[PDB]
Amino acid sequence: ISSTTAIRFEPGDETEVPLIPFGGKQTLYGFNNLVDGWTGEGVVPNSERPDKLEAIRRAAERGFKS
Amino acid sequence: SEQNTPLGGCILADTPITFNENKPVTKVKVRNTGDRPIQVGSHFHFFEVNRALEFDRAAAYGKRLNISSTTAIRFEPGDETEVPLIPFGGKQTLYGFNNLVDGWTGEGVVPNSERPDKLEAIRRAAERGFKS
Amino acid sequence: PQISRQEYAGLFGPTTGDKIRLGDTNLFIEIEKDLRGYGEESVYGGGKSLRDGMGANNHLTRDNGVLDLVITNVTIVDARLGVIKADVGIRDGKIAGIGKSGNPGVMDGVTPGLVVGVSTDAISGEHLILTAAGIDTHIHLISPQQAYHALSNGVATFFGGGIGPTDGTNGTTVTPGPWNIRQMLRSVEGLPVNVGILGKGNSYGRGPLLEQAIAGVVGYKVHEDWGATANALRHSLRMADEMDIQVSVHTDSLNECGYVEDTIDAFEGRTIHTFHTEGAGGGHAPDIIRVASQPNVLPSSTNPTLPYGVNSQAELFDMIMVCHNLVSFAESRVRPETIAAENVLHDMGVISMFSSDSQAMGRVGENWLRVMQTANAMKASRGKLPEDAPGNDNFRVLRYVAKITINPAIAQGVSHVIGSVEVGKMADLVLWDPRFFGAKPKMVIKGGMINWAAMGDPNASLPTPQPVFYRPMFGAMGKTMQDTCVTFVSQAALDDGVKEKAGLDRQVIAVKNCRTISKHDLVRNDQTPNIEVDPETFAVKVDGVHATCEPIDTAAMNQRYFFG
Amino acid sequence: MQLTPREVEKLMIYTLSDVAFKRKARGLKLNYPEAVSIITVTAMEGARDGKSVEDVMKEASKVLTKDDVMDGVADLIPNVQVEAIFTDGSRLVTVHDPIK
Amino acid sequence: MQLTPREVEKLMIYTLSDVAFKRKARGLKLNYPEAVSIITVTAMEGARDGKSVEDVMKEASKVLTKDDVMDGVADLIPNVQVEAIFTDGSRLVTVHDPIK
Amino acid sequence: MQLTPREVEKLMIYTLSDVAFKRKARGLKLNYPEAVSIITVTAMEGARDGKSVEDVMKEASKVLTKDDVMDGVADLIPNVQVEAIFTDGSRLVTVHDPIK
Ligand code: NI
Ligand code: NI
């Protein structure tokens, strides 16, 4: 979406949203302290980096609904 | 003899050198599951070697290869080799490598249980992708 | 009046639209812009224009901004300014202006700041090319004499490490620990080149890194030889970001703790300088070259693989086998396919810097030579770059120049003071004869003084009589050599009083802007394509296209020019 | 001629090998410096002559014998290395066990 | 022999020209340094031999041809200058367009 | 070759004597530096050849004559001294009145 704008998710509603990657260095510090690093793909097409899988696991047990 | 030694040469005695004699030896089976050659040296923390190596990782906890200081073992793609393992000396404090331990790798004092920091390590290997 | 080009050129050199052949190469540069008008041309001599009250001002004191030095009617080849004809002016060892020099009393169109006066000396640039001095990011401090070999190919800044011919220095660009650093800072006071020193990065806590930072390093070098671990990387980079200093890497060739992909992940999207990115000089075999796809990687090659020649495989093979006193490590280390690939990627703007690896597989006195040699081999094989202009090779040349000039500077956080011919920068400059471009310079200007030059018989009635050989000059003499030379350091160190503590007489300048930079900040070499390497045949694909070229038999600027 | 430090340094080699070649031709058995000189210049001259690294290497590994040197010198010269200027550039030449 | 800096410097010329003359005699086409060497020493030796500046000049402008040099070297050697020690003293010799 | 300062210095002698021997063979009468060179190298080469100090001395005192030198040079060379490397080591050789 447009820089500076937002999407509102009202209680009990469902919306489809478009997502895109961050630019630059793809270094994400802060927010909910889920990553505090590099969010890039790296160099291997048709595998996941382990720090990504770590992140994803950590979300799950901090309570971040999937 | 002395009459035959080249300029700066050495006259070596006969008796073989015996090293690492006291140290208990664990044999592990190692398969390289990657497409690229992997080579590991004598003092590397075997536990923390290249993710693509598949072996009993738990057995390599606190261990190094029981080879000559400064030498190495080459694991070519899709080959299987048995390797001798031995514990590290000194304080058994291992910092760095792949950041799997960053501590004490000793047995501690209780024969027929594992220390929990070891089990932590082993679990962490598993989910960082270090093949067992 | 009206004058013929040919007559004009003879007096003043080439102007806008005129083309110059760079040696015995097939590269032709073209003057884009002429900044110094027509009819009021500033030249030094008997009966000429820079005489008292005429082209030279004779009434202004120096504090009116009169120049200390002027370089006249010169062709500027620079990666940021391009290919221009201008007067260049120096004041307080700094570039004050690029434009039209003279006397505003008697002349129209004198660039502000380019007032020639009583204070001014002169250099005649008419038949000359002016460059920024090169910057060598991969120096092993094995031998102090390297500096002389460097100055003699137009390099005046060294980044690296060592402590003389120790086995650690022979293999790595490390000056380990605060004692050794101090020592080395003190030593380099005796050298006629700018210096910044690198430290040993392989550490577990902050302590050992911080130590060296304060002691004065500009960087940390992560090397296999001391451990190129994930741990090393991670802690080195975290510290770096703290200290505003750089990290350079020589990766694990054996794949002991990991593959390239794992190394990449150890970088943790953090800015890093990658030495010998191809791998012949070290690195994850066969495929370290894939790091050139990443936005956080500032890639370099060492100079023995550039250009790719017919003797290249023979040489390298045998070299490692002695470098490492040694065959399956060898033929995996030395890959024709990736070497060719390195050459292509250079030409594409995907590998951003040249370097030497001095007396640890490369040639400290051949960076400007090899750059030109590569550009020319590549024109031959590939033709014109798409962005080239049809009549000229400017786009190309300028890509290559960025490699030894502005790009190294940016990487080590010194582009604020050095690396381009631009206003406000340290006058670290090289003068060349076109006939000799890249190979054999005329002079080096080091902090506004001539430090190094091709000089014949000091007893002779001229400066030109034989034997002509490279010699130190007055900027290389006395207390001026320190005055005119910079020792680069960490801000941490600067702030802690390194200059006092270490007792340095050099200029001491803090490195800055190392950690916010990426590949895209690099000049003319900002490309991040997909790179794939075949683990069997070592073949390289760049956005799906096979990246190869054929070896050269004959190099330009080579056996014609050199006895060596 | 605008001689660079690398160019000037190489004059030492040329001077010592001229002396060395004169001595060998008198039947003198060569010493360490002298022998190293002759192997070095052989390479260097090959380079200039337009040969390959491979080819010069062979050539240089064959110029001197055990007979042509003083007893023990072999032990002092396991390998010789020099940078020479080949058609394609400067290249390192290692010559392995040159005194056979 | 009480060698002065000027005397010592001139040994470089003698060493490079000996190499150069050997190369030319093998049929090698000369490079820049080598060619400059041969012209320089020709002058120098003339001086020593007792000739005039005028006469040595001629001599030196005739020692090398286009054929004897590598293509382009001419463009690199428009003139050669050396100080030589003539019967009447040290004198500058310029040799104009020596590779014809 | 691990050349020491003493080793390197001796290259000057070898270079000047080569020039000097070429000149003498053209019939040029030698000067001071040149003549000193030839006597010096004669000794040096003798040493290397395995002769005695006594024997080299003789040899060197006989290489040059009054005829072979420029008038007066004798007066400039009363004696020549050099250290050479004999079988038993480095030794000083004085050569007394070498131009007879
Ligand atoms: Ni390296
Ligand atoms: Ni290096």
XYZ file of N, CA and C in Angstrom, chain D residues 12-13 15-16 19 23 26 28-34 36 70, chain F residues 1-3 7-8 11-12 14-15 18 44-46 48-50:
96
model
N 70.036 -6.847 -10.585
C 70.912 -7.659 -9.686
C 71.014 -9.073 -10.299
N 69.919 -9.652 -10.746
C 69.859 -11.019 -11.260
C 70.729 -11.192 -12.479
N 73.260 -9.350 -13.464
C 74.679 -9.141 -13.111
C 75.285 -10.384 -12.459
N 74.591 -10.962 -11.477
C 75.113 -12.163 -10.767
C 75.191 -13.331 -11.835
N 78.194 -13.246 -14.228
C 79.329 -13.734 -13.503
C 79.265 -15.259 -13.413
N 81.856 -18.280 -14.894
C 82.461 -19.229 -13.975
C 82.213 -20.673 -14.381
N 84.473 -21.693 -17.319
C 85.788 -22.026 -16.772
C 85.896 -23.365 -16.059
N 84.233 -23.998 -13.194
C 84.010 -23.882 -11.783
C 82.646 -24.439 -11.434
N 82.634 -25.192 -10.375
C 81.453 -25.652 -9.696
C 80.838 -24.523 -8.874
N 79.572 -24.301 -9.080
C 78.850 -23.185 -8.583
C 78.332 -23.391 -7.208
N 78.254 -22.319 -6.532
C 77.684 -22.106 -5.281
C 76.223 -21.746 -5.351
N 75.695 -21.540 -4.289
C 74.286 -21.294 -3.997
C 73.762 -20.051 -4.727
N 74.154 -18.867 -4.370
C 73.816 -17.658 -5.139
C 73.975 -17.714 -6.646
N 75.053 -18.197 -7.108
C 75.359 -18.337 -8.497
C 74.357 -19.254 -9.218
N 71.273 -20.333 -8.164
C 69.994 -19.681 -8.094
C 69.859 -18.608 -9.194
N 78.577 -27.331 -6.630
C 79.267 -27.707 -5.435
C 78.401 -28.616 -4.554
N 68.569 -16.304 -2.868
C 70.023 -16.318 -2.742
C 70.653 -15.666 -1.503
N 69.829 -15.008 -0.752
C 70.014 -14.384 0.462
C 71.307 -13.541 0.502
N 71.313 -12.592 -0.367
C 72.399 -11.646 -0.534
C 72.471 -10.603 0.547
N 77.935 -8.876 -0.549
C 77.607 -9.577 -1.791
C 77.018 -8.657 -2.827
N 76.081 -7.851 -2.459
C 75.461 -6.922 -3.346
C 76.497 -5.898 -3.839
N 78.701 -6.562 -6.837
C 78.158 -6.471 -8.169
C 78.642 -5.219 -8.931
N 78.848 -4.098 -8.219
C 79.368 -2.837 -8.833
C 80.702 -3.182 -9.527
N 82.026 -6.001 -10.720
C 81.764 -6.856 -11.855
C 81.244 -6.146 -13.072
N 80.376 -5.182 -12.849
C 79.770 -4.341 -13.901
C 80.781 -3.356 -14.487
N 83.540 -5.383 -16.474
C 83.092 -5.800 -17.776
C 83.179 -4.687 -18.816
N 89.762 -11.050 -6.994
C 88.481 -11.658 -6.716
C 88.260 -12.955 -7.460
N 88.557 -12.988 -8.705
C 88.343 -14.176 -9.486
C 89.348 -15.282 -9.175
N 90.556 -14.905 -8.866
C 91.559 -15.791 -8.376
C 91.209 -16.517 -7.121
N 88.306 -17.117 -6.076
C 87.183 -17.994 -6.388
C 87.637 -19.257 -7.036
N 88.634 -19.073 -7.879
C 89.397 -20.100 -8.611
C 90.232 -20.944 -7.624
N 90.431 -20.580 -6.350
C 91.138 -21.394 -5.385
C 92.586 -21.105 -5.100
